[PDB]
């Protein structure tokens, strides 16, 4: 679903964002992530902390982006 999609950090994605993952407002994909230009898809199962993949294809977000996905997934 589109539930899970996040705007990627245009700076990170070109090697130049100097913000902790946990203080930047956009996603920083572990370099194995499926990024559809601008958008990564968040890990449904990681949210419930229930992911178990070593190298994931769907981003495991930091806290703030996780609650921002909880908010987004309360909006029917
Ligand atoms: Zn950034
Ligand atoms: Zn995962």
UniProtKB/Swiss-Prot annotation:
A zinc finger (C3H1-type) spans 3-31, 37-63. It is found in: Nucleus; Cytoplasm; Cytoplasmic granule. Highly expressed in cardiac, skeletal muscle and during myoblast differentiation. Weakly expressed in other tissues (at protein level). Expressed in heart, brain, placenta, lung, liver, skeletal muscle, kidney and pancreas. It comes from the Eukaryota. Signal peptide: none annotated. It is linked to Dystrophia myotonica 1: A muscular disorder characterized by myotonia, muscle wasting in the distal extremities, cataract, hypogonadism, defective endocrine functions, male baldness and cardiac arrhythmias. Corneal dystrophy, Fuchs endothelial, 3: A late-onset form of Fuchs endothelial corneal dystrophy, a disease caused by loss of endothelium of the central cornea. It is characterized by focal wart-like guttata that arise from Descemet membrane and develop in the central cornea, epithelial blisters, reduced vision and pain. Descemet membrane is thickened by abnormal collagenous deposition. Interacts with DDX1 and YBX1. Interacts with HNRNPH1; the interaction in RNA-independent. Interacts with RBPMS; the interaction allows cooperative assembly of RNA-bound stable cell-specific alternative splicing regulatory complexes. Mediates pre-mRNA alternative splicing regulation. Acts either as activator or repressor of splicing on specific pre-mRNA targets. Inhibits cardiac troponin-T (TNNT2) pre-mRNA exon inclusion but induces insulin receptor (IR) pre-mRNA exon inclusion in muscle. Antagonizes the alternative splicing activity pattern of CELF proteins. Regulates the TNNT2 exon 5 skipping through competition with U2AF2. Inhibits the formation of the spliceosome A complex on intron 4 of TNNT2 pre-mRNA. Binds to the stem-loop structure within the polypyrimidine tract of TNNT2 intron 4 during spliceosome assembly. Belongs to the muscleblind family. This is Muscleblind-like protein 1. It comes from Homo sapiens (Human).
